[PDB]
Amino acid sequence: QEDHVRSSFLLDNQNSQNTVTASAGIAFLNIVNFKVETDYISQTSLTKDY
Amino acid sequence: YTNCKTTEDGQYIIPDEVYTIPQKESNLEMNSEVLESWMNYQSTTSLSIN
């Protein structure tokens, strides 16, 4: 009796996260008030199995 | 829907005559414009005749 068992498993995971926050606030002596905010969040996930 | 084709993420059951590509795009646009105008004026006139 001859038995040959070969098992190969492969897994790859790549995750990229990017967060950009830009805030600008200009406040004079109770006359001019301008506040602006910009938030950008990106998340990319890639999974490969074999 | 004989074979019940499923996407890579396993979230929807697509038919066998279509193909899906993971094209993920994010677009976040916040525009906050604050225009403030203020004025105050005070006048006082006093006249005295003796």
UniProtKB/Swiss-Prot annotation, chain B:
Mutant lacking the gene: phenotype: Impaired immunity characterized by a failure to efficiently prime CD8(+) T-cells to cell-associated antigens. Defects are caused by impaired cross-presentation of cell-associated antigens. In normal conditions, mice do not show any obvious disease phenotype or a change in immune cell frequencies.
Induction statement: By CSF1 in fetal liver macrophages. By interferon-alpha, by interferon-beta, by interferon-gamma and by bacterial infection with E.coli and M.smegmatis in embryonic fibroblasts.
Record's comment on post-translational modification: Proteolytically processed in two steps to generate the Macrophage-expressed gene 1 protein, processed form: cleaved by trypsin in proximity of the helical transmembrane domain releases the ectodomain into the lysosomal lumen to orient the pore-forming domain toward the endogenous membranes, and processed by the asparagine endopeptidase (LGMN). Proteolytic processing in antigen-containing vesicles is pH-dependent. Monoubiquitinated in response to bacterial infection; ubiquitination is required for vesicular localization and antibacterial activity and can be blocked by bacterial cell cycle inhibiting factor (cif).
Superkingdom classification of source: Eukaryota
Compartment(s) of residence: Cytoplasmic vesicle membrane
Tissue specificity comment: Expressed constitutively in a variety of cell types including macrophages, microglia, neutrophils, T cells, marginal zone B cells, keratinocytes, splenocytes and intestinal epithelial cells.
UniProt remark on domains: The MACPF domain includes the central machinery of pore formation: acidification causes a significant structural rearrangement, leading to oligomerization and deployment of the transmembrane beta-strands (named TMH1 and TMH2) that enter the membrane as amphipathic beta-hairpins. The P2 region contains beta-hairpins to interact with target membranes.
Subunit structure: Homooligomer; predominantly forms a homooligomeric arc-shaped pore complex instead of complete rings of 16 subunits.
Annotated family: Belongs to the MPEG1 family.
Function per UniProt: Pore-forming protein involved in both innate and adaptive immunity. Plays a central role in antigen cross-presentation in dendritic cells by forming a pore in antigen-containing compartments, thereby promoting delivery of antigens for cross-presentation. Also involved in innate immune response following bacterial infection; shows antibacterial activity against a wide spectrum of Gram-positive, Gram-negative and acid-fast bacteria.
Protein name: Macrophage-expressed gene 1 protein
Organism in which the protein naturally occurs: Mus musculus
Gene transcribed to yield this protein: Mpeg1
